[PDB]
Design a protein around this ligand. Structure first.
Ligand SMILES: [Ca+2]
Ligand SMILES: [Ca+2]
Ligand SMILES: [Ca+2]
Length: 294
DNA sequence: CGTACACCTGATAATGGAGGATACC
DNA sequence: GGTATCCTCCATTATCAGGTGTACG
Protein backbone atom coordinates (compact mmCIF):
# COMPACT_ATOMS: atom_id res chain seq x y z
CA UNK A 1 0.00 0.00 0.00
CA UNK A 2 1.14 3.48 -0.93
CA UNK A 3 2.19 6.42 1.19
CA UNK A 4 1.76 10.07 -0.33
CA UNK A 5 5.55 10.86 -0.32
CA UNK A 6 6.25 7.57 -2.03
CA UNK A 7 3.87 8.43 -4.73
CA UNK A 8 5.62 11.77 -5.17
CA UNK A 9 9.02 10.11 -5.28
CA UNK A 10 7.85 7.48 -7.69
CA UNK A 11 6.40 10.17 -9.89
CA UNK A 12 9.46 12.39 -9.67
CA UNK A 13 11.18 9.38 -11.19
CA UNK A 14 8.55 7.93 -13.63
CA UNK A 15 5.59 10.28 -14.43
CA UNK A 16 5.06 12.51 -17.41
CA UNK A 17 3.01 15.66 -17.31
CA UNK A 18 2.15 16.39 -20.89
CA UNK A 19 0.32 18.97 -23.01
CA UNK A 20 -0.84 18.33 -26.51
CA UNK A 21 -2.05 20.90 -29.07
CA UNK A 22 -3.52 19.03 -32.08
CA UNK A 23 -4.76 20.47 -35.36
CA UNK A 24 -8.43 19.89 -36.04
CA UNK A 25 -10.64 22.30 -38.08
CA UNK A 26 -13.71 21.31 -36.12
CA UNK A 27 -12.43 23.48 -33.16
CA UNK A 28 -13.04 27.29 -33.48
CA UNK A 29 -9.30 28.02 -33.02
CA UNK A 30 -8.21 25.19 -35.37
CA UNK A 31 -6.78 23.42 -32.36
CA UNK A 32 -7.70 21.02 -29.56
CA UNK A 33 -5.81 21.35 -26.31
CA UNK A 34 -5.35 18.33 -24.05
CA UNK A 35 -3.48 17.79 -20.78
CA UNK A 36 -2.25 14.33 -19.75
CA UNK A 37 -0.79 12.70 -16.65
CA UNK A 38 0.92 9.46 -17.64
CA UNK A 39 2.78 6.67 -16.00
CA UNK A 40 4.13 3.72 -18.02
CA UNK A 41 5.65 0.57 -16.46
CA UNK A 42 6.52 -2.94 -17.66
CA UNK A 43 3.62 -5.39 -17.45
CA UNK A 44 5.25 -7.09 -14.44
CA UNK A 45 4.29 -3.94 -12.52
CA UNK A 46 0.58 -3.83 -13.34
CA UNK A 47 -0.06 -4.27 -9.60
CA UNK A 48 1.60 -0.94 -9.04
CA UNK A 49 -0.42 0.80 -11.78
CA UNK A 50 -3.66 -0.43 -10.07
CA UNK A 51 -2.45 0.87 -6.68
CA UNK A 52 -1.79 4.35 -8.08
CA UNK A 53 -5.17 4.21 -9.70
CA UNK A 54 -6.71 3.24 -6.42
CA UNK A 55 -4.67 5.90 -4.59
CA UNK A 56 -5.91 8.60 -6.94
CA UNK A 57 -9.56 7.70 -6.29
CA UNK A 58 -10.14 5.01 -8.90
CA UNK A 59 -9.80 7.65 -11.63
CA UNK A 60 -8.10 7.26 -15.09
CA UNK A 61 -7.37 4.19 -17.31
CA UNK A 62 -4.82 1.50 -17.62
CA UNK A 63 -4.03 0.42 -21.16
CA UNK A 64 -1.42 -1.36 -23.24
CA UNK A 65 1.39 1.09 -24.24
CA UNK A 66 4.30 -0.76 -25.92
CA UNK A 67 4.94 -4.42 -26.70
CA UNK A 68 5.28 -5.25 -23.02
CA UNK A 69 4.39 -2.00 -21.10
CA UNK A 70 1.20 -0.49 -19.73
CA UNK A 71 0.21 3.16 -19.13
CA UNK A 72 -2.00 4.64 -16.40
CA UNK A 73 -3.39 7.94 -17.77
CA UNK A 74 -5.67 10.76 -16.74
CA UNK A 75 -6.64 12.90 -19.78
CA UNK A 76 -9.78 14.54 -18.41
CA UNK A 77 -8.81 18.09 -17.59
CA UNK A 78 -11.59 18.10 -15.08
CA UNK A 79 -10.37 15.07 -13.19
CA UNK A 80 -6.70 16.53 -13.32
CA UNK A 81 -7.88 19.69 -11.73
CA UNK A 82 -9.87 18.00 -9.05
CA UNK A 83 -7.62 15.13 -8.12
CA UNK A 84 -3.99 15.54 -9.51
CA UNK A 85 -3.43 19.32 -8.92
CA UNK A 86 -4.48 19.26 -5.28
CA UNK A 87 -2.38 16.20 -4.49
CA UNK A 88 0.86 17.70 -6.08
CA UNK A 89 0.23 21.23 -4.71
CA UNK A 90 0.20 19.66 -1.25
CA UNK A 91 2.89 17.01 -1.87
CA UNK A 92 5.46 18.55 -4.21
CA UNK A 93 7.92 17.12 -6.68
CA UNK A 94 11.56 18.16 -6.03
CA UNK A 95 13.40 17.15 -9.36
CA UNK A 96 13.11 19.16 -12.56
CA UNK A 97 9.90 17.29 -13.30
CA UNK A 98 8.51 20.02 -10.96
CA UNK A 99 9.06 22.56 -13.75
CA UNK A 100 6.92 20.54 -16.03
CA UNK A 101 4.27 20.01 -13.34
CA UNK A 102 4.10 23.81 -12.81
CA UNK A 103 3.78 24.59 -16.51
CA UNK A 104 1.29 21.71 -16.93
CA UNK A 105 -0.71 23.31 -14.06
CA UNK A 106 -0.95 26.80 -15.63
CA UNK A 107 -2.19 25.11 -18.82
CA UNK A 108 -5.03 23.49 -16.79
CA UNK A 109 -5.84 26.80 -15.04
CA UNK A 110 -6.26 28.31 -18.49
CA UNK A 111 -8.38 25.32 -19.48
CA UNK A 112 -10.51 25.74 -16.33
CA UNK A 113 -11.36 29.24 -17.60
CA UNK A 114 -11.95 28.33 -21.26
CA UNK A 115 -9.17 30.63 -22.31
CA UNK A 116 -7.98 27.66 -24.41
CA UNK A 117 -10.96 28.13 -26.68
CA UNK A 118 -9.63 31.69 -27.47
CA UNK A 119 -6.74 32.78 -29.77
CA UNK A 120 -4.77 34.54 -26.96
CA UNK A 121 -5.17 31.76 -24.38
CA UNK A 122 -4.20 29.17 -27.01
CA UNK A 123 -1.01 31.20 -27.70
CA UNK A 124 -0.26 31.24 -23.96
CA UNK A 125 -0.68 27.47 -23.82
CA UNK A 126 1.64 26.92 -26.79
CA UNK A 127 4.35 29.09 -25.14
CA UNK A 128 3.83 27.06 -21.94
CA UNK A 129 3.96 23.75 -23.88
CA UNK A 130 7.24 24.89 -25.48
CA UNK A 131 9.08 24.81 -22.19
CA UNK A 132 7.80 21.29 -21.07
CA UNK A 133 9.92 19.30 -23.52
CA UNK A 134 12.89 21.19 -25.25
CA UNK A 135 10.47 22.95 -27.68
CA UNK A 136 7.45 22.54 -29.89
CA UNK A 137 7.16 20.06 -32.76
CA UNK A 138 7.94 21.12 -36.33
CA UNK A 139 4.21 21.56 -36.92
CA UNK A 140 3.42 23.84 -33.91
CA UNK A 141 6.62 25.90 -34.34
CA UNK A 142 5.27 26.80 -37.84
CA UNK A 143 1.67 27.38 -36.71
CA UNK A 144 3.01 29.67 -33.96
CA UNK A 145 6.27 31.26 -35.19
CA UNK A 146 5.53 34.22 -32.83
CA UNK A 147 5.51 32.32 -29.53
CA UNK A 148 8.29 32.78 -27.01
CA UNK A 149 8.49 29.75 -24.69
CA UNK A 150 7.33 30.56 -21.13
CA UNK A 151 10.60 30.66 -19.21
CA UNK A 152 11.19 27.55 -17.02
CA UNK A 153 10.48 27.86 -13.21
CA UNK A 154 13.55 28.58 -11.10
CA UNK A 155 13.47 25.43 -8.83
CA UNK A 156 16.22 26.03 -6.32
CA UNK A 157 17.70 23.90 -3.50
CA UNK A 158 15.09 21.23 -2.91
CA UNK A 159 15.63 18.87 0.02
CA UNK A 160 14.24 15.36 0.15
CA UNK A 161 10.91 15.98 1.85
CA UNK A 162 10.54 12.60 3.53
CA UNK A 163 12.29 9.15 3.54
CA UNK A 164 9.34 7.63 1.66
CA UNK A 165 10.09 10.06 -1.14
CA UNK A 166 13.39 8.19 -1.65
CA UNK A 167 11.78 4.76 -1.43
CA UNK A 168 9.36 5.94 -4.08
CA UNK A 169 12.00 7.50 -6.21
CA UNK A 170 14.36 4.49 -6.14
CA UNK A 171 11.38 2.32 -7.05
CA UNK A 172 11.21 4.15 -10.43
CA UNK A 173 14.82 4.92 -11.10
CA UNK A 174 17.36 2.87 -9.11
CA UNK A 175 19.21 -0.42 -9.47
CA UNK A 176 20.28 -3.04 -6.98
CA UNK A 177 23.15 -4.50 -9.01
CA UNK A 178 25.03 -7.75 -8.31
CA UNK A 179 28.27 -8.14 -10.20
CA UNK A 180 30.62 -11.08 -10.61
CA UNK A 181 33.97 -9.89 -11.84
CA UNK A 182 36.96 -11.94 -13.04
CA UNK A 183 39.74 -11.90 -10.44
CA UNK A 184 43.20 -13.29 -10.84
CA UNK A 185 43.92 -13.18 -7.10
CA UNK A 186 40.67 -14.37 -5.38
CA UNK A 187 40.79 -18.18 -4.83
CA UNK A 188 37.32 -18.85 -6.38
CA UNK A 189 38.18 -16.78 -9.46
CA UNK A 190 35.56 -14.11 -9.21
CA UNK A 191 34.84 -11.04 -7.01
CA UNK A 192 31.26 -10.58 -5.80
CA UNK A 193 30.43 -6.94 -5.97
CA UNK A 194 27.19 -5.24 -4.88
CA UNK A 195 26.38 -1.80 -6.32
CA UNK A 196 23.49 0.49 -5.46
CA UNK A 197 22.96 2.93 -8.25
CA UNK A 198 20.60 5.79 -9.24
CA UNK A 199 20.70 7.17 -12.82
CA UNK A 200 19.34 10.65 -13.65
CA UNK A 201 19.74 13.28 -16.26
CA UNK A 202 22.47 15.78 -15.41
CA UNK A 203 19.86 18.55 -15.09
CA UNK A 204 19.12 16.99 -11.67
CA UNK A 205 22.74 17.30 -10.41
CA UNK A 206 21.60 19.06 -7.22
CA UNK A 207 19.31 16.26 -6.39
CA UNK A 208 22.06 13.80 -7.11
CA UNK A 209 24.46 15.70 -4.81
CA UNK A 210 21.88 15.77 -2.05
CA UNK A 211 21.74 11.97 -2.14
CA UNK A 212 25.27 11.87 -0.77
CA UNK A 213 24.50 13.89 2.34
CA UNK A 214 21.05 12.27 2.82
CA UNK A 215 22.44 8.71 2.82
CA UNK A 216 25.87 9.52 4.28
CA UNK A 217 27.63 7.55 1.49
CA UNK A 218 28.21 7.16 -2.28
CA UNK A 219 29.61 9.29 -5.08
CA UNK A 220 28.52 10.89 -8.38
CA UNK A 221 29.92 9.87 -11.77
CA UNK A 222 29.14 11.37 -15.20
CA UNK A 223 28.44 9.02 -18.18
CA UNK A 224 31.06 9.99 -20.80
CA UNK A 225 28.61 9.38 -23.73
CA UNK A 226 26.03 12.02 -22.68
CA UNK A 227 24.33 14.18 -20.00
CA UNK A 228 23.48 11.51 -17.43
CA UNK A 229 24.76 11.08 -13.83
CA UNK A 230 25.12 8.08 -11.60
CA UNK A 231 24.78 8.10 -7.86
CA UNK A 232 26.81 5.03 -6.95
CA UNK A 233 27.42 3.09 -3.73
CA UNK A 234 30.05 0.30 -3.92
CA UNK A 235 31.57 0.34 -0.42
CA UNK A 236 30.16 -2.83 1.16
CA UNK A 237 29.96 -1.57 4.69
CA UNK A 238 27.99 1.42 3.45
CA UNK A 239 25.75 -1.11 1.76
CA UNK A 240 25.33 -3.23 4.91
CA UNK A 241 25.30 -0.26 7.26
CA UNK A 242 23.33 2.47 5.40
CA UNK A 243 21.57 1.39 2.24
CA UNK A 244 20.19 -2.02 3.30
CA UNK A 245 18.77 -0.53 6.53
CA UNK A 246 17.28 2.42 4.78
CA UNK A 247 15.27 0.34 2.24
CA UNK A 248 14.29 -2.15 4.99
CA UNK A 249 12.27 0.52 6.76
CA UNK A 250 11.40 2.47 3.64
CA UNK A 251 10.47 -0.32 1.35
CA UNK A 252 10.81 -0.35 -2.42
CA UNK A 253 7.50 -0.71 -4.33
CA UNK A 254 6.80 -2.81 -7.43
CA UNK A 255 8.54 -5.98 -8.45
CA UNK A 256 11.91 -4.33 -7.88
CA UNK A 257 11.21 -5.11 -4.22
CA UNK A 258 11.98 -8.90 -5.06
CA UNK A 259 15.28 -7.59 -6.50
CA UNK A 260 16.16 -5.66 -3.36
CA UNK A 261 15.40 -8.81 -1.32
CA UNK A 262 17.69 -10.98 -3.39
CA UNK A 263 20.43 -8.37 -3.23
CA UNK A 264 19.99 -8.49 0.53
CA UNK A 265 20.42 -12.22 0.39
CA UNK A 266 23.62 -11.82 -1.55
CA UNK A 267 24.80 -9.31 1.03
CA UNK A 268 24.14 -11.76 3.91
CA UNK A 269 26.33 -14.31 2.11
CA UNK A 270 28.96 -11.65 1.78
CA UNK A 271 28.80 -10.59 5.48
CA UNK A 272 29.44 -14.29 6.49
CA UNK A 273 32.33 -14.42 3.98
CA UNK A 274 30.69 -17.30 2.10
CA UNK A 275 31.25 -15.46 -1.24
CA UNK A 276 34.87 -16.55 -0.91
CA UNK A 277 33.91 -20.26 -1.22
CA UNK A 278 32.76 -22.32 -4.21
CA UNK A 279 29.35 -22.95 -2.53
CA UNK A 280 28.57 -19.37 -1.67
CA UNK A 281 29.66 -18.14 -5.16
CA UNK A 282 27.11 -20.56 -6.73
CA UNK A 283 24.35 -19.45 -4.23
CA UNK A 284 25.10 -15.92 -5.47
CA UNK A 285 25.13 -16.98 -9.14
CA UNK A 286 21.63 -18.53 -8.56
CA UNK A 287 20.21 -15.46 -6.72
CA UNK A 288 21.55 -13.11 -9.39
CA UNK A 289 20.06 -15.28 -12.08
CA UNK A 290 16.53 -14.81 -10.65
CA UNK A 291 16.91 -11.00 -10.37
CA UNK A 292 15.18 -8.82 -13.03
CA UNK A 293 13.20 -12.21 -13.65
CA UNK A 294 10.34 -14.41 -12.10
C1' DC B 1 43.76 -12.47 -1.01
C1' DG B 2 40.45 -9.44 -1.56
C1' DT B 3 38.11 -4.64 -1.96
C1' DA B 4 36.69 -0.35 -4.08
C1' DC B 5 36.46 3.68 -6.91
C1' DA B 6 37.24 5.20 -11.80
C1' DC B 7 36.19 3.80 -16.13
C1' DC B 8 33.75 1.00 -20.03
C1' DT B 9 29.56 -0.72 -23.06
C1' DG B 10 25.38 -2.59 -24.88
C1' DA B 11 20.12 -3.41 -24.46
C1' DT B 12 15.62 -1.79 -23.67
C1' DA B 13 11.69 0.02 -20.51
C1' DA B 14 10.54 4.55 -20.07
C1' DT B 15 10.22 9.31 -22.15
C1' DG B 16 7.06 11.68 -24.03
C1' DG B 17 4.85 11.63 -27.64
C1' DA B 18 1.21 10.45 -31.92
C1' DG B 19 -3.59 9.89 -34.48
C1' DG B 20 -8.63 8.06 -34.96
C1' DA B 21 -13.24 7.18 -32.91
C1' DT B 22 -16.65 8.33 -29.75
C1' DA B 23 -18.95 10.69 -26.10
C1' DC B 24 -20.87 14.89 -24.49
C1' DC B 25 -22.73 19.98 -24.18
C1' DG C 1 -21.74 21.56 -34.98
C1' DG C 2 -17.80 22.60 -31.29
C1' DT C 3 -15.78 20.46 -27.43
C1' DA C 4 -13.93 16.89 -24.23
C1' DT C 5 -12.51 12.16 -23.35
C1' DC C 6 -11.32 7.30 -24.57
C1' DC C 7 -8.54 4.27 -27.04
C1' DT C 8 -4.53 2.31 -29.77
C1' DC C 9 -0.02 2.76 -31.23
C1' DC C 10 5.27 4.34 -31.66
C1' DA C 11 10.74 6.53 -32.26
C1' DT C 12 14.39 7.67 -29.28
C1' DT C 13 16.92 8.05 -25.07
C1' DA C 14 17.27 7.86 -20.31
C1' DT C 15 18.02 4.79 -17.92
C1' DC C 16 19.40 -0.25 -16.47
C1' DA C 17 22.49 -3.62 -16.39
C1' DG C 18 26.43 -5.83 -16.90
C1' DG C 19 31.26 -5.65 -16.93
C1' DT C 20 36.94 -4.19 -16.19
C1' DG C 21 41.69 -2.03 -14.31
C1' DT C 22 44.53 -1.71 -10.75
C1' DA C 23 45.87 1.04 -6.32
C1' DC C 24 46.03 -0.37 -2.03
C1' DG C 25 45.61 -2.66 2.88
CA1 LIG D 1 12.83 7.99 -14.82
CA1 LIG E 1 10.68 18.08 -19.28
CA1 LIG F 1 13.07 4.12 -14.50
Amino acid sequence: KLNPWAVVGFIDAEGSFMVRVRKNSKYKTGWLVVAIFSVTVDKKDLFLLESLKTFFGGLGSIKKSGNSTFSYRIESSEQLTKIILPFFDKYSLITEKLGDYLLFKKVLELMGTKEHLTQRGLEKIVSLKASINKGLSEELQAAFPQCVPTPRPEINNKNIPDPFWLAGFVSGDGSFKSILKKSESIKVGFQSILVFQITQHARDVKLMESLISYLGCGFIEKDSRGPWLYYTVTNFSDIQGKIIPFFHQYKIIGSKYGDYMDWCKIALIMQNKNHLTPEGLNEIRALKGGMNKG
